[PDB]
Amino acid sequence: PRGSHMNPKRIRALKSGKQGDGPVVYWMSRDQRAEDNWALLFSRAIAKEANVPVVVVFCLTDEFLEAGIRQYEFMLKGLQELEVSLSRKKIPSFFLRGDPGEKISRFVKDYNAGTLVTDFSPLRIKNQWIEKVISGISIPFFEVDAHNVVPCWEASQKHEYAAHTFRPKLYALLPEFLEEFPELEPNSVTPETLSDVLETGVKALLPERALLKNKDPLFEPWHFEPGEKAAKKVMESFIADRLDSYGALRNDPTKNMLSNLSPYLHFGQISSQRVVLEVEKAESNPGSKKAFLDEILIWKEISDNFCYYNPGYDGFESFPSWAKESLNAHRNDVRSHIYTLEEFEAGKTHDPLWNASQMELLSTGKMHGYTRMYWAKKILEWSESPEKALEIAICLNDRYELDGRDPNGYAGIAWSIGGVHDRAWGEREVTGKIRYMSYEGCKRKFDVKLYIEKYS
DNA sequence: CGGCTCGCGCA
DNA sequence: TGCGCGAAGCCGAT
Ligand SMILES: Cc1cc2nc3c(=O)[nH]c(=O)nc-3n(C[C@H](O)[C@H](O)[C@H](O)COP(=O)(O)OP(=O)(O)OC[C@H]3O[C@@H](n4cnc5c(N)ncnc54)[C@H](O)[C@@H]3O)c2cc1C
């Protein structure tokens, strides 16, 4: 498709056709940012060769109703910042509301677009939208992987069983795809109020707000400032203050020593490639650098590999054969406790460590990476069936996590409950051969009282 | 055949 | 606290 610093393997054609005379439309979805965006850079390079301008279109679907206000505000406030950023470079943005399959097909014809570009996402509803758009448009339709360092269809062509199998593949293509980003060139040609979409959506999600007894909201929105500018500040402080002690205190929820980048990385407000570019150049603890790189490279992109090659990524059928056989044999085992969704949601279990994990999820919208395993694994231990446990874990994960509705969530829940990307362990009642995690093992690794007293 | 992102005993 | 074994099924290099 042309360009000096542009790798042609990051782009693949979804539909071939005669390139129109109008501008190039970039259908923004996952990577909501202006800097370090391959999809936005590829749309500008195409527009430069065709002597056309580049426009951005964002379709606001009804998916914000299944979520909550904490995710809707975090996204809308970032889109307000992105509008001024793109407007500074003479790039206009259009914000549509409704079905992307019907709205973007109408936008391409109404605006007489010449080439449509979109970003990559392995989720089901994105592939369903792209198929409906292809059937209604007559212009070329391209797809760019701007989220992963190595494109998903390039790192592997099949489902990866474990990380130590996917690890040598990723690090082998790293010297080719780890490159610096060129600056976005402003538009030479210039061819819906976000404040109203914010107030309308908030009033519709007000009854579903998570409250306390005194009708006070549980969400604390001052923990993570949304936007592209704030996301870069979280990156800088992590590499300057937290990266040294990461490899030693990454599993201690009493110490705020993780990167805290998952809410920004989910909405695409910060590029993981930019994070790797800056972490690699830093001089820090070599063990901590290798530990953080293994999280943002393999485990982040193997989760995209999981959902892209397993369409039932949120179902029991995606589990390995050994895990399904073990879970099916222990279906009739008597459970120590049985809790419904409402009891798991409000945090009314006998385990104070589990309840404290749920309060962190409800109050801050981001539960610590270590306690998320204890949170999900105990849901499987105290549920009717593995299907209900998978249902409850996915529901609370997508409802209250700021990084929810993300491939890392479904892969992480499939790891905790279904042993995906994991191996078998000692045979137990109810759980079977799935990895076990107890309250006593957490007491030997960190001060469990400080974590419980912090969140009641 | 080697080695994979827990619990547990022992310094 | 950090280290080493145990319990377990399977991929992938040959
Ligand atoms: C049951 C369960 C549910 C999860 N739900 C989500 C979710 O909804 N959204 C989400 O983005 N992540 C999810 N994760 C993955 C992981 O918990 C988060 O990425 C992490 O805890 C967020 O904090 P952090 O980015 O500061 O951690 P860091 O240690 O700083 O992580 C660095 C980055 O590496 C990646 N990463 C780290 N751990 C994982 C992992 N286990 N799997 C995949 N990528 C990882 C993420 O991009 C993360 O931003 C879940 C994990 C589990 C076990």
UniProtKB/TrEMBL annotation:
InterPro entries: Crypto/Photolyase_FAD-like_sf, Crypto/Photolyase_N_sf, DNA_photolyase_2, DNA_photolyase_N, Photolyase_Class-2, Rossmann-like_a/b/a_fold
UniProt keyword annotation of Membrane present: no
Domain of life: Archaea
Cofactor (UniProt): FAD; coenzyme F420-(gamma-Glu)n
Family label: Belongs to the DNA photolyase class-2 family.
Name of the featured protein: Deoxyribodipyrimidine photo-lyase
EC number: 4.1.99.3
UniProt keyword Ribosomal protein, yes or no: no
Gene3D superfamilies recorded: 1.25.40.80, DNA Cyclobutane Dipyrimidine Photolyase, subunit A, domain 3 (1.10.579.10), HUPs (3.40.50.620)
SUPFAM superfamilies according to UniProt: Cryptochrome/photolyase FAD-binding domain, Cryptochrome/photolyase, N-terminal domain
GO BP: any one term: UV protection
Catalytic activity as recorded in UniProt: cyclobutadipyrimidine (in DNA) = 2 pyrimidine residues (in DNA)
Organism: Methanosarcina mazei (Methanosarcina frisia)
Pfam families, alphabetized: DNA_photolyase
NCBIfam families linked to this entry: phr2
All residue ranges annotated as the Photolyase/cryptochrome alpha/beta domain in the record: 22-152
Keywords carried by this UniProt record: Chromophore, DNA damage, DNA repair, DNA-binding, FAD, Flavoprotein, Lyase
GO MF term (any one): deoxyribodipyrimidine photo-lyase activity
